Specification:
Oligomer: monomer
Shape: globular
Radius of gyration: 8 Å
Organism: Cucurbita maxima (Pumpkin)
GO molecular function, one term: serine-type endopeptidase inhibitor activity
Strand content: under 5%
Helix content: under 10%
Largest sheet: none
CATH topology: R-elafin
Distance between the termini: 9 Å
Family: Belongs to the protease inhibitor I7 (squash-type serine protease inhibitor) family.
Number of strands: 0
Keywords: Disulfide bond, Knottin, Protease inhibitor, Secreted, Serine protease inhibitor
CATH architecture: Irregular
Protein name: Trypsin inhibitor 1
Number of helices: 0
Length: about 30
């Protein structure tokens, strides 16, 4: 659940770094 507070777009969870996942806004946590 280590996902620093950043607002970038994504398409799938594994899109961002660390353990971030793609939330409702289609953006990473």
């Amino acid at each position: 659940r280590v996902c620093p507070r950043i607002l970038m777009e994504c398409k799938k969870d594994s899109d961002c770094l660390a353990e971030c996942v793609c939330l409702e806004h289609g953006y990473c946590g």
